[PDB]
Amino acid sequence: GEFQRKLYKELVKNYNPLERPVANDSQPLTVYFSLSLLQIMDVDEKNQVLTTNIWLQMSWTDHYLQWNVSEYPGVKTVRFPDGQIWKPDILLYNSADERFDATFHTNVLVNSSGHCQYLPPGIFKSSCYIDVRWFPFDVQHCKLKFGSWSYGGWSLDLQMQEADISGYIPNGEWDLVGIPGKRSERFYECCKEPYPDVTFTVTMRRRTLYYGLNLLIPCVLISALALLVFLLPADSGEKISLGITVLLSLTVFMLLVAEIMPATSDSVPLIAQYFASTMIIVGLSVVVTVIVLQYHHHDPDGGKMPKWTRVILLNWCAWFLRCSEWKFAACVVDRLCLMAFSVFTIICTIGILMSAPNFVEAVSKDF
Amino acid sequence: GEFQRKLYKELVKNYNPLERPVANDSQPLTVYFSLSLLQIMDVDEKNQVLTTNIWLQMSWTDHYLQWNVSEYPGVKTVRFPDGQIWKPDILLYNSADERFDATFHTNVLVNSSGHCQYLPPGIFKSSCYIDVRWFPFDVQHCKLKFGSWSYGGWSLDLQMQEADISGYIPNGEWDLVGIPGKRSERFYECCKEPYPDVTFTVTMRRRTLYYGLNLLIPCVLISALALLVFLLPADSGEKISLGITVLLSLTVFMLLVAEIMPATSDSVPLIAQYFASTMIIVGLSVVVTVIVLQYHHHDPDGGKMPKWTRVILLNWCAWFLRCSEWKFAACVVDRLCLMAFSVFTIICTIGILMSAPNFVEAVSKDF
Amino acid sequence: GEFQRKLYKELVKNYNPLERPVANDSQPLTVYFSLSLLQIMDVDEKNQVLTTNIWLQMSWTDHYLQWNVSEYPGVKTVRFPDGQIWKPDILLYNSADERFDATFHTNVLVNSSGHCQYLPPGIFKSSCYIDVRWFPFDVQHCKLKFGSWSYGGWSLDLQMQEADISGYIPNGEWDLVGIPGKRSERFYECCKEPYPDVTFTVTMRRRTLYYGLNLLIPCVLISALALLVFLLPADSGEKISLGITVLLSLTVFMLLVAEIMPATSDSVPLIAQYFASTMIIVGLSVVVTVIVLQYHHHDPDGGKMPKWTRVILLNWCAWFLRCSEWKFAACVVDRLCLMAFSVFTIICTIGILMSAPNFVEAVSKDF
Amino acid sequence: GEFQRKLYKELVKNYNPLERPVANDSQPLTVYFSLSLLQIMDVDEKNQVLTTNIWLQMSWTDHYLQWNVSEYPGVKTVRFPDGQIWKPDILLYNSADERFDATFHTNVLVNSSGHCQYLPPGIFKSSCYIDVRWFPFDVQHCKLKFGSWSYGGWSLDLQMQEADISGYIPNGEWDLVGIPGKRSERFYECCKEPYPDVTFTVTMRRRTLYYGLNLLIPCVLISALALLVFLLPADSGEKISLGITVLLSLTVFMLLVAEIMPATSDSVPLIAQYFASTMIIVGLSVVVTVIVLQYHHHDPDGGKMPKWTRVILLNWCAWFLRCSEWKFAACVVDRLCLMAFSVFTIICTIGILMSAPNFVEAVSKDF
Amino acid sequence: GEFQRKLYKELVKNYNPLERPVANDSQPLTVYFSLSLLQIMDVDEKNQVLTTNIWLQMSWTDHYLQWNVSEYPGVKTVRFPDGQIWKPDILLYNSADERFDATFHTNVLVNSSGHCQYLPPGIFKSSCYIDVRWFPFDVQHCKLKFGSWSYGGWSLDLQMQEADISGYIPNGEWDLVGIPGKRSERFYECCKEPYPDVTFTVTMRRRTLYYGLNLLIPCVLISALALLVFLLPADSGEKISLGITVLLSLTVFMLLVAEIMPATSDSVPLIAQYFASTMIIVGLSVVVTVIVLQYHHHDPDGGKMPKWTRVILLNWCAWFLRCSEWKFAACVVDRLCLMAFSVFTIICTIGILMSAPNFVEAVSKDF
Ligand SMILES: *[C@@H]1O[C@H](CO)[C@@H](O[C@@H]2O[C@H](CO)[C@@H](O)[C@H](O)[C@H]2NC(C)=O)[C@H](O)[C@H]1NC(C)=O
Ligand SMILES: *[C@@H]1O[C@H](CO)[C@@H](O[C@@H]2O[C@H](CO)[C@@H](O)[C@H](O)[C@H]2NC(C)=O)[C@H](O)[C@H]1NC(C)=O
Ligand SMILES: *[C@@H]1O[C@H](CO)[C@@H](O[C@@H]2O[C@H](CO)[C@@H](O)[C@H](O)[C@H]2NC(C)=O)[C@H](O)[C@H]1NC(C)=O
Ligand SMILES: *[C@@H]1O[C@H](CO)[C@@H](O[C@@H]2O[C@H](CO)[C@@H](O)[C@H](O)[C@H]2NC(C)=O)[C@H](O)[C@H]1NC(C)=O
Ligand SMILES: *[C@@H]1O[C@H](CO)[C@@H](O[C@@H]2O[C@H](CO)[C@@H](O)[C@H](O)[C@H]2NC(C)=O)[C@H](O)[C@H]1NC(C)=O
Ligand SMILES: *[C@@H]1O[C@H](CO)[C@@H](O)[C@H](O)[C@H]1NC(C)=O
Ligand SMILES: *[C@@H]1O[C@H](CO)[C@@H](O)[C@H](O)[C@H]1NC(C)=O
Ligand SMILES: *[C@@H]1O[C@H](CO)[C@@H](O)[C@H](O)[C@H]1NC(C)=O
Ligand SMILES: *[C@@H]1O[C@H](CO)[C@@H](O)[C@H](O)[C@H]1NC(C)=O
Ligand SMILES: *[C@@H]1O[C@H](CO)[C@@H](O)[C@H](O)[C@H]1NC(C)=O
Ligand SMILES: [Ca+2]
Ligand SMILES: [Ca+2]
Ligand SMILES: [Ca+2]
């Protein structure tokens, strides 16, 4: 309108996008970098990649994009696309995206004082170490490391502002504890110039109820069936079939769990160790029961001729609770297996009750 | 043709795409923003992202793209590609797309009065909160928030026009109740200039029959089997195997349901709670029946020696309906479990009959 | 070669790609639009999107790209890339692609008379309504709607030529009946100028044998098992287990079918209704048999004390074919269920034998 | 270095990338097209698309990119990016890629004689007809059709050179027999100018052992179980359950096979026909055995009253090998079913032993 | 700031990005190429493609990008985007990416001496031969081959620097042994000019515990069940059903294994051969037991009439350990099958204990 056109013509008369916009070349350019978390799209524990929906916020002063408001009435701000003016090269250092730059290059808003505002949105994919050991009561500290790609501390004085979380959409699987930020420096051996960066640590807590019932109901059922087969009579007929079916069902369930979560060898989840203990206990009990039944139902003394087993079973039954002796030995072994399974379940429950994600507090908040 | 070429040469003589095309720089530019919904591609409840096929509609007046029709006979409209002329930076604020701009940049149609028309098509992916609690009788209000990225109310006077739905292709899984629109403002603490935006709320109702039979037939079958095992005699032989098989089948079905829909911890679906109640009832009944049978078939009084259980069962049988006492106690427990399951089914049906998506009206319209 | 270089320099001396190449600006530009179908990549019934491999064919006369062959010996054609010259903005209106333009922008072939040829290949993804109701004997009419995005009938006189199918690679799942074309106009209320478009209707017939055996063999097996359990004696022992296993297997098969095809609520497939009828019949028969066996094996008259059931069963047995009465009643009920299942199977076969995709003709052509 | 810079400035003084670089415009430009296969990424039998990793090789002489080596000491070659100089528009005609051009546009290497070298790498996706009928002993001839998009034989004299396979990485699922090439012409009715193209036929043989054990072990097991149930006594008790379980397992296996490979209706695989024959035989045998057992175990003559069945069974037993007659008839039927299954297995093995991929030679080479 | 702008204007006065920046054109340009491995994203054994997160490091001296620091106070470094200055065309030769260039083109950092630094990040997908034969104790040597695409050894003197691994994030499935580098030359028959390249061999060891328990627990269970059925009495009733169920479960497990890993025919994994041996042993044992039971339970001598079998079984029982003879023969056959299975398990364990990935050392380090 005879003023905006003239201003746009005048501002880019000799402007060079490659030049860092400072009046004095030996002075640093202060850039205020902030963040606006909006949504946690995905937490891939397989590839250790966190996907988030983030609006970056960058602000700096341009020495050449200044004008007198009185000389250009009615126009107070101008917009420049990607390549028209200089922008800081703030990139996510730990970006796992195949493009390495998920930001959408919007226009830079500059007002009459030369203050530029740049808010590039994007779906950032950052590679963070997923420590899945206290499954499912685990908290992940995924870091977002931002910094200038080719500017030092004496050229781009990067500064930090607290991230904005008043736009956040709850994920439904992870609970956002918070996203604190920190500014650190990267002094090199070559040179005394610092290399600042801004790191935002997305502290997230896994929501219990998402996997809670879906894993507890099968686990409760298989534990009840294990107790049942540890209490059923030896000569019941269906005990062997029930045990085999239970083992097949729970190993298919464990295969499904390993398909959903990754059973990373860096730190085996405690649930996997509990399952392994249950498997070895159930297998030993079933093998002992089957061999006793198949070696003592037809021959009264076919496998009972060793003396060491007889004396050790007598000592164990005297130290534990005190048709032939084979039935009593099988019952004692089954009771011992039941006691061991109960002790393991109790100790696992005790060890999982206390943790950094307080189980009692979590269930009180959820339920 | 000696007139279109001359007009195109004349129109871009001093035109600047960065300049907002207003005769007076202090006056707002009125932009009419409308929408044309065509198809609902996908409703991802996992990532809370809605995918739609939408044709945007933007209209504004350009002060510099005006010409005299008599001076240029035969030409009444001109087209300019993406970067040739100025276009409003209307973007989907809640876009979850990795590109953040799904629009296809078509040509801007300008006629002799300077009126520009811009209709960019695209497959928009917006992040909306999916409240899946009354599954499957749920209605989702997914919002599409459009607004200028870097213009205020005194620069780009955004206006709303009612969305066009006379091109809509039915989804087959979701029923489109409607897409009302609203224009709101975003006054900041810094400044009195409003920041208008246009929000279209895609109100969608899940079609019943899509998941209806596929979830009812397994649910009806498992409920019938639960009633059967709650009515079968205790000493039937196959009762334990039937119960275990039923539990395995329905827990696999629940795993499939959790695979298809997300069991979000924000609000657990009522179907999940009903399944949990059925699971606890069936497990308790099976455990009680098995323990009674295994502790009373060989010993007439091996687990019946406690007095509290005997007196409480006598009181319950006197207050409910009034071979040894163990069979009668097992029958009473089984009848109580059947009654509890029937009451839970009835109350769940009553609570799910009434809702915002009226169940009776929905089935009347569908069937 | 001193002539091609000179011609290329001369042709683009004042050429404007934005100008429509007509000698008279008030005269329409005739553009002949044709199509060359090559392959049907995918038919997504979930999102209602058809993916095809298509070579477009556009021809028009350019007034400015003309030269004298004698003055430029040896050169008869020239090529111009995307942005060098004017091309019609013919786009797929119902494109479901995220880019909205799957065409690969090749060079435009222009000869000495100004006749331009443009053949952009691409993998088009168009959104067509998939009416899957007569599964698997269904024919889909997916339309490809092409037209100018910003030109009317008095500016771009779009014309149609018959599509070329002598390059088509058979899909193996769908049979191509044909792709007829049609040209229609879109008169607006504003103005009398028509808005022509060219629509190609890809009429495709699903090949029977692809899903034929894969669905018939499980269906034949489950139908045979249903007849078997409807003919087996009540006191056989394995009847209940066989029925439960059959129901579980066929409901898993129906889950697989719903996973492969979409059970759209717009029109439920007839196979789904047949499965629902079979399910209700089998469930009723199994429930009746189980309740009769469990209420009459131990008590000669425990559930037979009502008079209405006895008299109605006597009337039914007198009107149908004419150890205690319970066995005869169970046999009569089982025979009635078998007869109902046979009638339903016969009527379903009769109703599916006749259709627009003639079943007898299809199997004669395939087998 | 005062010579490379001068040469680069001089070479592009009047160079036009649109001009075909020939001294005489009426003379063809000879382009030598070769190929360098590196890896067969994927063979999609569903969409009939072959994915390969290929380095193209194009060579031609540029008349204008010539210089005197003595006048420019030290520089013998120059490089030009995509748009700087002219390149042939050699494209894969049958490309199924959504971009239609998988080549990565590298620099063109030109030496002092004007000879240009262009080696664009890419991951080509070509649509070839997959004839999967002799599964798994099948050989696929997938063609790669390359040619100029807009040049005739009198403008671009395309020539063929033998493909290079000394970089090939074995796929592990397909064995590369060879990739012969051929040059053909495409004379049109309009004009006598030929339209040459270069076609490379990727002849590939499926490696036996990849699917060999994975399909043979289930097939061997189900065949052994079929023989077992065809040899087990009728009154064994578990015969019906074993047969039903075998049928369910093998139909799930066939569902898995149809999920992995496509059961295309163009030509049904022989394995599918063998499975159908086995299914009908097993179903008939099971139905006959069950009906005989259920109609003759309680009534000595309840279904044996027809005379035609009795006389035909007497004739068959006299012509085949020569408690009541029902057991003998059931045994004769079971033996006949076993003989039919054995004959079908033998004839299938004989017919699959001989083929273009010689089974004996293949197993000798592999084992 | 009156110095950076002047320097940027002066540096690109006559700069040509196509020219190789050397003072003398006949002298090679030394380029130091290094690598910085950060993460191993994926190891696809199906397509033989390795996905890694890598920061490249390239350094070279530019003759024209030099300036006097005193003449331009305060500015010591400059940045140029992709197309502004010359960069080496170092590409991954064995790249399997569809783009062939995963690098993100950042700015080139040049200081006053003309020394340029280029650090392009990217997610590289390279095609390496995956030799999966000693599953799961296998080490993969995946090579990353980098080199100039169109420069010889006398033009681009490529040099190697040791890769940096102090940023590496552990994968959790693969253990990084190391990434040694090597520089080699590619002399051609045409010419004596070498063609150097830099190859980094990513030596990776599969972590045991990732698949360890998940494959051992099913394998241990099926081995225990095989021993059980090889020790159970012949006339146990459930032996046949248990064997069939075990076979079905383990063949489903093998199908799952073939789904996860590829059973490549180049070299069959030892686990597959062990499974095949177990399958043939179990099948033979089950068939022999079933045929003996079905041919000797009703007829004392119905299949024992041959003399060769009787004499060979007598010899075997005399050479092995020394109701009718059929039971003793069945027991001897079952014991022989058990012994063969035990020998095969022992020899497989012995052969898998020793390997390049030392099993004992690996389990000592992990456990
Ligand atoms: C241009 O925009 C900047 C944005 O920061 C304005 O700077 C702010 O001005 C207010 C005065 O109302 C101060 O309270 C803030 O502290 C300033 N922020 C910073 C970072 O300096 C600046 O005033 C604007 N220019 C004009 C002419 O209005
Ligand atoms: C250019 O196009 C605009 C499109 O809006 C025309 O403006 C409309 O003109 C009609 C008159 O037939 C009015 O009824 C509408 O209310 C106008 N709409 C708006 C938004 O102003 C305009 O007339 C066209 N110019 C010419 C010269 O025809
Ligand atoms: C340029 O190409 C066009 C292609 O259509 C030629 O026009 C055709 O010419 C033939 C004469 O051999 C006629 O039979 C066709 O009917 C014409 N087609 C159309 C659409 O007009 C044209 O002749 C070519 N120019 C020259 C100089 O050869
Ligand atoms: C430029 O490169 C071409 C590449 O082909 C050279 O042409 C080859 O030259 C050799 C001589 O050593 C002949 O044996 C080949 O037959 C030629 N090939 C072709 C296709 O003509 C050419 O000599 C090079 N120019 C210079 C000046 O060395
Ligand atoms: C420009 O950067 C290069 C980076 O290598 C500098 O070269 C290094 O200079 C140091 C002196 O402090 C030497 O120890 C290294 O050996 C040099 N490296 C190489 C590869 O030559 C160079 O000095 C810098 N220029 C200026 C003016 O500081
Ligand atoms: C802006 O212009 C006014 C006159 O229009 C003048 O008084 C004022 O000093 C100017 N400001 C600057 C910063 O030049
Ligand atoms: C357009 O031109 C005609 C003469 O050709 C003139 O009468 C008319 O006033 C002009 N209109 C405008 C708006 O300049
Ligand atoms: C082309 O040039 C020839 C002479 O070379 C002339 O006779 C002829 O008329 C010209 N044609 C046109 C259309 O100008
Ligand atoms: C190249 O230059 C030399 C002199 O430097 C001259 O003798 C020779 O003829 C020239 N070659 C050509 C092809 O012009
Ligand atoms: C740089 O400039 C200073 C004077 O400012 C001069 O003494 C010195 O020699 C110059 N260096 C070069 C390399 O030209
Ligand atoms: Ca996840
Ligand atoms: Ca499909
Ligand atoms: Ca494949």
Task: List its traits.
binds calcium ion, homopentamer, binds a molecule of 2 linked components (NAG-NAG), seven-stranded mixed β-sheet, alpha+beta, binds 2-acetamido-2-deoxy-beta-D-glucopyranose, Acetylcholine Binding Protein, Chain: A, 7 helices, membrane protein, 367 residues, 23% strand
In summary, what is this structure?
The PDB classes it as membrane protein. Chain A is α+β, with helices and mostly antiparallel strands.
The gyration radius over C-alpha positions of chain A equals 33 Å
Given this structure, which CATH class of the largest domain in chain A is correct? Mainly Beta
The SSE string of chain A, one letter per element, is HEEEEEEEEEEEEHHHHHH
Span between N and C termini of chain A?
Answer: 62 Å
Main pleated-sheet profile of chain A:
7 strands, mixed
Task: Using a beta-carbon cutoff below 8 angstroms, give the protein chain pair with the largest interface and the number of residues from each chain.
Answer: A-B, 60 and 51 residues
CATH architecture identity of the largest domain in chain A = Distorted Sandwich
> Which word captures the global form of chain A?
rod-shaped
Oligomer: homopentamer
Distinct bound molecules: a molecule of 2 linked components (NAG-NAG), 2-acetamido-2-deoxy-beta-D-glucopyranose, calcium ion
Compute the number of strand runs of chain A.
12
Assign the CATH superfamily of the largest domain in chain A.
Neurotransmitter-gated ion-channel ligand-binding domain
Residue share in helix of chain A: 25-40%
Strand content of chain A: 15-25%
Number of helices of chain A: 7
CATH topology of the largest domain in chain A, by name, is Acetylcholine Binding Protein, Chain: A
Total separate domains of chain A: 2
Q: Classify the secondary structure makeup of chain A into a structural class.
A: alpha+beta
